[PDB]
Symmetry: C5
Subunit: 339 residues, 5 copies
């Protein structure tokens, strides 16, 4: 008769008040938290948040519930009866959205042990805020957090602490479409301070390194191929007008359809992303490679025997300068965005 | 037994009626309001609103709840019992939608003190309407508000008032993907006047300043360069049929593959914006420079000396007209939108 | 004790029943409606609906709630006990979805007066269906409505009625991203006749004038410019292959990149809009101008005396005919879609 | 006091049990169903479904509720008391999600008549699944159904039935952005069979005919025009002919990628897709045809320029002939 | 009076308690599950999941509910009274989202038979995280699962089992916009092991092959035709500048518009797909054919020497890469 033994511990004749905490008069209650992340995803930068599906598990002691007389060494309080026992008011500080699960039954479990220790396993969906900076897109790396805090109880009455062993665990094979969730999860404190008191808070931080593979092959490399076709105009005489104009116009026009083609499938933000610079710089090196040939024609238009040497002087310079100047920019870009 | 002493104040024996307000006979209830914004964003012109996540603290006095004999200086009421006390009918006048949070327990707190003061903290999500004007895009600024009004109670019975120090606070590091949330939050009244009565209302106003970075680098700067290349056609003589046509075709064609490219990420509004003008004006100047050469070539079609003077005049005029015409427009443009 | 006096009118020893309507014996209950519109937007051609946030104020007489003995001249029933009083089965006929607002408290009010009148104010979100025809887009106009109907009472027992003074009001400074909301609101009856009886229904019509600007500057104008550039090829001699060909190519290619450029931002429907004609006609005029050169070159190919005369005669007509034809089309078009 | 006379028929002393059906021992309960569609829309092939807004109206007989002593010849059960009377366990078999409506009051009605008939009108939003095949897009036509089945009662205890006169009506002036809802709906029976019994089920079938107008004017016709300029290019004019061949290919490839953004998301081939791929050949091969001419006429002699006159003369009456053969095939297949 | 007999079995006087399981003293409760699927859909790499619609059916034995005295040999408990009977604490381990149905009545059914057997059928909407690798688009294949685990009960007290006959059925006619539901579903155990115990879990594997039709006609073939135009320029002599220059420029400019025309109808992932390699390889082959002519014009014996090689090598080198490609992405 375990269900029956419980309402002797919880009921009218027991004298249990779930509105009152354990050790009411004396020291604080110690709640040992740990989670399991079964699902991690929907990281959006427009709403600046991410969704996670977890099992939260709180463990604590309530000496009001300790027993001995009964043979079975642990009792399972029914989900519907959960009001009838005190439990901590842990909430997620940075939660935007939240809900419990109730299919097929309530996804909640409570075990009170013989020594009074309680075990509370509960399954949640959680939308949490993660302020995001795309400055270095697409070589950026984000840091999302998750704060377990007490709502009304202070440090004088309630204290949260992580598990010593694997407090935060993540399901095997979980994938994100754009980031990689890293294996390191930094645990730390966030104990808040207000003029209304001091409140317990424990934190876990996830790290999210973005992937480039797509932008590398479908944007950086093709733009590099076009900037290489900009330089071959230099290795032709001034007399061949059709080639150097057509190439220059192609190179410019092709680079322009590429920089516009990309824009529709990039994160829509107001500030300058690292990718936005690459497109701009690549446009100069295509633009000026056409503007170079215009400067050659303006000097070598007057077909004097002397200045054709000094006009071909521009071309001999550019043959070494444009490849070098590009490589000086290139070496800056990848060193800065892979420091 | 603080929870038991509490329901001596609330219970049938007390004679407390939660439908009735404090000081029901005479003067109005003074309610002191303040908020902490933990999340700000989802600012959308499409639905013309924004989304916030807040704490809302409310402090008033109830002389019925005051007590003395009991030791503990403040009693807190359970979140399941809130309806047994009176509380103010505060609602957000420009709420498109709202709700509470109840994970893991109800995110609500109430403290009633020995003196009779009641402190009521509530966590909330609100979607509030923010009528927006994008006439000056992307050099616009917006002003989203937030009104705390009383529903049923008039000025005679209820008054809402902000805190003196730091009434409306905002969490650290809350980035937005487009706007910048300014430090200045203005505080005023919105007391409503209907035939049915006067109604207390307080208001806090935010200021949002849109960033340009991306549009400056992907639109303005690139377009500026394509318009200058349009002018160099003037500096070539009439004989160079390939060059002058090649530039005119490239410039227009390149200007067009930028305008279509930029449309992708423009805000969804069916009216004219600052950005749209610029793009249309830059089209005219690129189009008409090619149209000018058509008028030059048409005049010198007649190969006599009278007409070659007429056609030589057009270019030499155009060399110092287009750059003046542009500058005069450019001066207007940037002066108007950065007044 | 105004709370206590109410439940003397409603409670056990009163004999009042909420299920029964006022004047149950004979004549119908005249309900007086009026709304205030705080929010208006989310107009979609995909879901073919719109979203409004409103107050709704119903007013009727219940002689059963008449009193005098009690000092105060009006009582307010609590939002929780609205079930204990009769109120009209008013529902919105074209509602797709709707909700009450209950933050921070239930956003409802109900006064019962000394003479037995009622005043029921209620805040509501409504998604209403609005069939929309985009045949003339973007020079179209839509007329969304809003019907207040009784669910189960006929005109014999229940009649709805608008107010005489400002029965429908819209908040100051609301804005829509695509449409303009006109100040005129047509009021009328929608009384429904079924085989089960005749039911009360009252309707308010809003009219929406779609905004043009963006499509004018970003699509109509550029398309016009590209048509003008098609005509400049008539002002070069038949000889110049590079120019006359390259113009025709640019114009046709450029024109096409815009029609598809616009597609991504147009309201996605399967039928022909007015803008879709424009782009298609503009395509003909650009295509046929290139086609005209092909005929000219086709004729004068056999370069004798008679052929080059008849070939040159085409271009001379084309300089007049094409702009004339376009102007005739253009006058018809804009006169038809702005009759 | 009609309210009070009702709870005389329902209350403790009446011996009414809402959990037990009418005609409990004997014959099957006959329920006549009919719907009024106020909204029909949100038809998506991504989630593969559509969204309706309807008035369901169920009529059955309950001899336990028949009366006579009361003057009023029909009694209205309040929506709050709906638990207190037996009513059918109707459910929409192909519903992905539904809900009720409750603004301002509960959007429900019940009427029990003097003779025992019950009349239960209710208001719903349904999201019904509609499998959708886009092989012939945009010349396709879809069929979306709606099944009203009994959850737990079998053919022996419960049978569903459409009204004889106009059981499924649709509201005046309802527009869809892509489809046209056809006037003729069909009615039939979906009566299900399992090991656990035979369950009544009635069904209505809507037909949805997609519109082409837009795709005709801004896609099909243009592609026909560029295919014409592939034929006008039909020796010496090297800058012109090759430019006409090149332009067609450029202007075609911009039209192909131009549409892709607007088209529906499906990984299989559509009719629209074939057209563009076919029209890409007829343009691509026109330029490819002149590369055979320029390869043969490159050797400037008597026999080479005569052989290079044979190619352009055939293509003036072969490409138009070949296209027209394919064209007639295409349109006759996608409009039988 | 079957409704009045039930609350004799369940009610106060019986001493039945739904908080306690059948065979509480000793051996496990054997539940036998099975599902009908009326909707597999909303597969989404962005959220990394699909939303399914099902009937679930659980059958077990409860000897506290056995009877014989009553004539009718099976009783139907009302959906409203489902609290007052024990039933398994089944949950889907890989649910992100799920819900019951309430229209028009509660879509649930419970029969208790003469021999204490309970038969519980319930209608549900789920959403099940399906981690998808997309590295071989659009020749990829994806194995979505669905786990039915016991929340609180171990293997000592509760065991799930699929039906022996047609445990997982799928409704006729269903279609997907991008994939196929492969006929063969797998079944297996997932039984979880923890430090708190060993929990019963049964699972079904749906396989889904993605379709290539759209990308074949609108991408792979048009990319091939452009690469064929890259080879015709070789056959032209070194003299013809406009012809060979116009080809390369057309070939490049055409290949750029297709490769950007695809971007719109590709899935939202940051990593390299197989489609991307093909687009990037078909750039090189166009790009280099133009770059070859630059070496020919930058160099009459050696200038005509390069053209004769690239008529054979480029169609071959392509064919060599191509063979690897389709063999690696169709092993
Ligand atoms: C419900 O419908 C069935 C079928 O129409 C009815 O059963 C018939 O009853 C008539 C007389 O009422 C007989 O003549 C037929 O032979 C019956 N046919 C069948 C197939 O049963 C039934 O009576 C109807 N009404 C109820 C149950 O009240
Ligand atoms: C439920 O399932 C298992 C396997 O069918 C049964 O387990 C057997 O239980 C009996 C009686 O306690 C033991 O003697 C056997 O050794 C068990 N065999 C096993 C585990 O392989 C169980 O009895 C079944 N039915 C019940 C408990 O009603
Ligand atoms: O009076 C307050 C306002 C302040 O609001 C910001 C959020 C806070 C987080 N928790 C939520 C409830 C609160 C609290 C607890 C006990 C008495 C007063 C009280 N609050 C908030 C407070 C902080 C700290 C604490
Ligand atoms: O009679 C009214 C209608 C009017 O509706 C718009 C909104 C208003 C804001 N609050 C909400 C309830 C209301 C009010 C209070 C007491 C008696 C009548 C009454 N109302 C609304 C009124 C205003 C003012 C007030
Ligand atoms: O019998 C009916 C069905 C019919 O269905 C379409 C909608 C209607 C709108 N209201 C809702 C309830 C209804 C009504 C009132 C009283 C008795 C029967 C009854 N109904 C519906 C009816 C119409 C009219 C009315
Ligand atoms: O045992 C079952 C499983 C089967 O599942 C598919 C759907 C069905 C539709 N309704 C829902 C409940 C059901 C039923 C009724 C009475 C006893 C058992 C039972 N069910 C399901 C059944 C079919 C038929 C019926
Ligand atoms: O203590 C725990 C935490 C752990 O959480 C991950 C999920 C699990 C699946 N079910 C859910 C409840 C749980 C369980 C049952 C009985 C005592 C403790 C307990 N739990 C979770 C546990 C595993 C196993 C089991
Ligand atoms: C709980 O909290 C602290 C930290 O370990 C400690 O002082 C105290 O003894 C702990 N144990 C209790 C209250 O039982
Ligand atoms: C509340 O404020 C008003 C005005 O500030 C004042 O008249 C009143 O006395 C104050 N205090 C109360 C009503 O307790
Ligand atoms: C309601 O209006 C009707 C129509 O004018 C009138 O006949 C009736 O007397 C009015 N008042 C009632 C029924 O109380």
């Amino acid at each position: 008769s375990p269900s029956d033994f419980l309402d002797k511990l919880m009921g009218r004749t027991s004298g249990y008040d779930a509105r009152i905490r354990p050790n009411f008069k004396g020291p604080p209650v110690n709640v040992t938290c740990n989670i399991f992340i079964n699902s991690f995803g929907s990281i959006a930068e427009t709403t600046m948040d991410y969704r996670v599906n977890i099992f939260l598990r709180q463990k604590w002691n309530d000496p009001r519930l300790a027993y001995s007389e009964y043979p079975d060494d642990s009792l399972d309080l029914d989900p519907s009866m959960l009001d009838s026992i005190w439990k901590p008011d842990l909430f997620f500080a940075n939660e935007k959205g939240a809900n419990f699960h109730e299919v097929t039954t309530d996804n909640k479990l409570l075990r009170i042990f013989k020594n009074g220790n309680v075990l509370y396993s509960i399954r949640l969906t959680l939308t949490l805020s993660c302020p995001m900076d795309l400055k270095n897109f697409p070589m950026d790396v984000q840091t999302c957090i998750m704060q377990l805090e007490s709502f009304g109880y202070t440090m004088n009455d309630l204290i949260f602490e992580w598990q010593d062993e694997a407090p935060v665990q993540v399901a095997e094979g979980l994938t994100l479409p754009q980031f990689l969730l890293k294996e390191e999860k930094d645990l730390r404190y966030c104990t808040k301070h207000y003029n209304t008191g001091k409140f317990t808070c424990i934190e876990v931080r996830f790290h999210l390194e973005r992937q480039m593979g797509y932008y590398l092959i479908q944007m950086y490399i093709p733009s590099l191929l076009i900037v290489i076709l900009s330089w071959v105009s230099f290795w032709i005489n001034m007399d061949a007008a059709p080639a150097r104009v057509a190439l220059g116009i192609t190179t410019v026009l092709t680079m322009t359809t590429q920089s516009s083609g990309s824009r529709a499938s990039l994160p829509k933000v107001s500030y300058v992303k690292a990718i936005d610079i690459w497109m701009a710089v690549c446009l100069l090196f295509v633009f000026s490679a056409l503007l170079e040939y215009a400067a050659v024609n303006f000097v070598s238009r007057a077909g004097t025997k002397v200045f054709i040497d000094r006009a071909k002087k521009i071309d001999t310079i550019s043959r070494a300068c444009f490849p070098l100047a590009f490589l000086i920019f290139n070496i800056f870009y990848w060193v800065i965005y892979k420091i």
